Symmetry: C2
Subunit: 306 residues, 2 copies
Amino acid sequence: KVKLFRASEPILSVLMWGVNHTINELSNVPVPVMLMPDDFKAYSKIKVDNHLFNKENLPSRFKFKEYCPMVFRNLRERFGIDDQDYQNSVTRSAPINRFLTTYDRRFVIKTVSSEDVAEMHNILKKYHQFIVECHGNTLLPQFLGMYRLTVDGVETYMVVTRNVFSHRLTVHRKYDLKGSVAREASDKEKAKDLPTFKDNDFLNELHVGEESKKNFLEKLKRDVEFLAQLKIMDYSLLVGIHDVDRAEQFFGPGEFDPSVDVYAMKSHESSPKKEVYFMAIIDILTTVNPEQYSKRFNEFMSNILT
Amino acid sequence: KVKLFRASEPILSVLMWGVNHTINELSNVPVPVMLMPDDFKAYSKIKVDNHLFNKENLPSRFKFKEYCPMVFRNLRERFGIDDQDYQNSVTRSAPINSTRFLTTYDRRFVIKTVSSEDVAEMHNILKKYHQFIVECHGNTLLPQFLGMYRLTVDGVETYMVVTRNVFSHRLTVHRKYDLKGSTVAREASDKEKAKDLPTFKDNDFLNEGQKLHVGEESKKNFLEKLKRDVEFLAQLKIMDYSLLVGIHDVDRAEQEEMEVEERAEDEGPGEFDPSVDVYAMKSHESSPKKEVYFMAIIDILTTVNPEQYSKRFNEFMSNILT
């Protein structure tokens, strides 16, 4: 209950302090009957300027800013995420390795630009109403919070999402898929321990059954169609495969809580390999178009599952 | 759980918010082995700029600064005050009037509005004051300093010093005095005398033939505390403090209470916890009316000399009681 905010970097400690502060503050704000237009233009800003006090892990001076806190708190609720757990995932231990992850791997913390923040504000209302409408059952990124950190006079923007991958299960194959032209992974990329394979890598070489294919493709058509309405493109389908048998060499094989690992789906019983898949849409912020991009994306993702 | 910080004035909302905030933050600072010189020069500053957010009770923009929070946390500890109790006494409901003399809703603590010179003086005296509080284990008639803050609302600064209440947080004061020992005239004004609970002075107590019946055990303890506190004040450049004296009539309270329950109809007793009401003395057994007194030294921040003022203070206050 004594929360030091020890971290590898001052910036991370400031993040921890900041989520802590803002989440607490929000625990002193009543959950409204509904969001109002102003909430979509609102923010909190804090400037800390301490002196000879509590400088073990935190800087003496810094700034923290949370964009649209009522909206993100409502999003958090809609995604079945308790403010307290969110807070604990950020504050109990330094987030880890620009893409970061909370120590418990539940949440991804992505550094962004000023333009991503603007874009976010631009789509936030429609995004929220869409989340409401789909009861949070979506394949889009699930945005949990958005922050601006000012450390040493240097502004850093962050967006917090639920992890596409399991927070426990090891991912054994990564693909990033646009359905696009053509693209592959490099010698530079095929070098890594975790290669980000691509469309050509995948087509060169997913078994969930026809009901799962139904619901997944349903979700996808609805999300990709929403993305085309907002006239967005160049996003991908992030796909990760956990090979159950490979991992076997408290515990639980291929075991996971689908209320937590939200994008996880298991192999059909008559699958060649015992496997768990993770599939979501990413990169929705920053000679074709949405209609063409959206529909092509759909064709491709469709001929990916059986 | 949901603390709204609702108040009569924005300034009070900021105070509630500020105490809540600083105590919470201190909850994430390890309590140390011994206070360091740095702790006596230290402070926390926070600037809040909320835009279209949380603006029902709080100002959108305000600043809160706490002076030397490690030291006042330690003082709180040495005075038997738990941080959470403190924080709750400030946040659960708005502090009430008695700026510039405020009380928490539960009558436990006093919030005084002070000058920047007063804050500066506190800083001059804080190390020695803390040392004294240490070597006397909190048993003192001096003001018991619990925190010191600067609030900024609409560009305007306000400084506050929080103290433990001299009076009981339950037992109601039926008559009060401010005593100095001043050979000079010390009298209550027609203004003050017209008030509901006038604050009487030296010649008011002398003329009224007032005396407080505590019996010698209580009296010796008290005179010993006073002697040491006043010598401590004289050690510094300190003079012109007063003895605040509150008198609570047990019977009179009983009557008031009776009238209350009797109104409700149509529409222990004189006891006190000495760990909470820290300046409180029961009337002696063989004493006229059953009273409870509250006696503390106040006003120590802002021809005769401080040593002399100290001995004279002490003599007058010896004579105040039997």
